């Protein structure tokens, strides 16, 4: 639509959703064959190509609920996208979340008002598609890549003075990022399938960072789990 | 505590959580060996007994978030209960939810204020324990019992003039019941494991009912999946 | 309906509403003549019998807004119940509320979302029926039983980390329990009459407890005021 | 304080609270002896005088929660006022509320945010002082003046496009006015006594009006009940 | 209407809106020629007269959102008032707001629920009419009267235990008063023009007061800017 | 910081804030001299260059409150940016907003929860810096470029089933976009200066579109007003 300059057919049934349009470029060129780039609108690149003879697209989302909602909306409405898989990172908020872990979000908490706007006095708990969830999980187990299944927290403010993540951590939440709630909610709304796969960028509470070498490895594992889940 | 008249040790690591204290009585006597009844307070019976040489307790919860929260709180705080497994029914709100299906709740939406009281402007999405979730799922697949994984809706009002379930159905929600949010939220809060396994009592939207014979079968499958998941 | 296995006529115009179905059993057998038990569904016993030649029923409610709402709904809708009188206990939250006092709730505050779901941005203050309120008050004065008239607080969480009762106490609130808001709101909604009569179970803030002998006496006074108000 | 130009002692233990400062002037001159006028600030007149040898003050409040809160605050804080009695009118919202009826508010619903600001996710139900309530009720019964006891609705918007009074009426609410919630809430907060006594200005829903002769009579009865309750 | 006893034509296109009906009396008699007083209802005086041969009315509002809303509603609906200009004072909440400054409100924050009632989950930011805003600003600059343009905070509680003004100050808010949000919101709603011009009554946070001589001067400047803006 | 790969000094006191990083590239190359590009992180380009010998930077923001908040935060915190000026487009929601008009936002309404998270029960009305506002306005008047001053609406959902813009239009709101509330709120919070200047992309309600030639012209006028306001 408005935000994606592609012709129908240029986008696959399955799309991967990095936040960074350069991580989109990177993924495609490193992982896929016969790459075509279908969108340059706003520099939020989308690429279609193939992986083991099966078409896969990879589309930047931007940061925040309102940005990804745009792309997820159009991908669904204008291009009949069936599987949508966020591949990104999160800030870990618990010691037991290890920097090599690969996270599969079952659900997500949020301070985005997107759902309270739709639902009023209902707390809508979004939900990953289980078939995709299990595939990814199996793909990880099969190869021995360390994986954790629980929830994340989709923030509106990266810099947030009134952050309640200390309380979210006690309730089991694994980490913070900025897209999952939007993804899971829009996909379910339109009878599509979605899943969010995440790496640990750093520990937000211990302030402790992860090295460029740790980031590259888990990144590659993430893409692997995503691609192998779709085989 | 206050609500459970038991001596420490009388309650197993794993407790099953029917809504009905008579379904508690029924489950124990039909499924377990050497049954002892540890609680008669308020007629909300709890029973400990064994299944294949492993201790399992079964404790009535009552109906509603505030009732189950009581029992889940005390079971956790006063008796160090590790696994808590709701076995109950739900009203289905989608055609694709079939009356023979067995539901495993990944998460739950609610109009209970329990979480908005704790979290303010955060929408807290509760989360099933995945290890328990997968066990139950495997137990079902192994035996060929039909199973669905998604979300339910924990209502406060059984009779609810302002029910939004028509909108919840469009977003993928499977059915309505009255306990899951409380269960999943309290268990995560205290580092314990929880899962909610449900049968389809009827279709709320199509008004269409399920027969006493359908109810008995799926009920038995539910208990099986619950017990076999714990083996 | 669904929750009460009775035939029409088996339930009186006036029903008393203990929380505990065993306190239901107890009340009936101790206070009424020719007791019939009309409901065993879920072990939430209801009993009809007579007191001085006038029919009175006594029905367990369970704990929490969502539980009592069920019974109050069905009692009203399926059995044309006119007077509904909660007889239960509360935790006192002020020094001036004395352990021998009998409380008549004029109204109730809540953190239940039941009313915000119905009303949006209106704070609905529920209201006892005054004719019943005055009767009970008179019955107490006549016999010299100590009585207090003010408000209570209907909680959702018995165990509540974010309890504001310290602020509720300053505003005059007398004590905490878990049913009144539901009772008063549903009864008014259907043009019926309701009242909540309560004993002081203990002081929540001073942590100070009440003895089994104090509980028995005030309990008996409570039933007396309830029964004599209905004479 | 800021809003009342009086010297300590100039204001009685008991104050009556009309909305209209000219109804303040009127009440005093018609009902009281040896009238002194203690406040002319902003033309919101307050008068002290006597009725049967007992001092009574009468103080205008203005319209709206935020206006009366000012006067009730200062009367309490700066002049140790013990009894505060709103004498005003309301718009009736039910057929059964008759234009000659005199209303005693047990409680009040509101769309004012005053309490949600103080309490967050608690619905605070304000509460009339029962001793004052009963006195007024008795005074009415004694003289045979028709009286009704229930709740009113304190509005913020006189002209309100999103008025929910049609729903409030079904739940038993008697009528709409603009002060009671503030009165009852501030008085309880400071351990004082308050009551709101109201006449039916008109029926808001039937659009049907009341004549100048009906208004005068019920007005006089209102003052009588107020004064006789204080005797 | 109900609240203003005037005949059509008695009220000018432009009305000034002091809070105090005696400041209404004062303004008219000091600033206008051939003064007629059109309203005495409730002692909330309105006056029409002339200033340099142009008709200007001046109408008391009372205190609080719900009070001014009444007068602004009727002035708009029953008397086709085009320009409405609040002339009042505010409590300053920042050091940089100087006691001689004259404030022009671009917008206003509030804890009034008036807008959340209308809009649900939208934060409605009210807006001054810019043409009026600029006129007033120019009038000030022309004469060298010190002027500041930013936002104020419309409070519901003058005495407010849960005041967040310390946080409002950090976000740039200039001062607190009790009417602006109502004014700006109702005027925009009906395609009319509104502006709020304010003097600094005192600094709320530094507790520091302003002398009767400072108040008189800035008051006079305020009226000047208001009148000259309308020339 | 994290999101901007620049060295201190590389970013000017004044930054322009298009949504589109390619509109950032375009603006700089067309309007500025000696352009250096300081940021390529995530392809959200920032450029510093000069306009009439004065340094001006131009930085992409992405779409949505959470995206721009990131850039506005870092620009303020890590690079001491003083003036921040959004240059973008909006969807007009009123007939009187003409496709050639240039909008200066005094304030903005939102359904973003960003402020309710910070403020609870306060409606925070953000506020443009008036000195910048007036400069831009003057720059427009001087050259005769058509300009309108009022409010806009910052949406979270571009595709929004529960859009209330029909009600926002009646209250005077000019158009919808996705950044202003974040901009104005963060800038005020840190004692900086902000303004949002917008073109009319299309009329959302009349569905009627604007041609590529209309867009180019108003775009150029927008940049002119922005640059000339800063001269």
Residue numbers in the entry:
A (entry chain A), B (entry chain A), C (entry chain A), D (entry chain A), E (entry chain A), F (entry chain A): 2 to 232
Task: Give the authors' words.
Purine nucleoside phosphorylases (PNPs; EC 2.4.2.1) are versatile enzymes that catalyze the reversible phosphorolysis of purine (2′deoxy)ribonucleosides producing bases and (2′deoxy)ribose 1-phosphate. For this purpose, we choose the hexameric PNP (BsPNP233) from the model specie Bacillus subtilis, which displays great biotechnological potential to produce NAs, including the antiviral drug ribavirin. The crystal structure of BsPNP233 confirmed that it is a homohexamer with D3 symmetry as observed for other hexameric PNPs. Analogously to other hexameric PNPs, BsPNP233 is a trimer of dimers where each subunit interacts with the adjacent subunits forming two interfaces: the catalytic, which contains the active site, and the inter-dimeric, involved in hexamer stabilization.
The crystal contacts are similar in the crystal structures solved in P321, P212121 and P6322 but differ in the H32 space group.
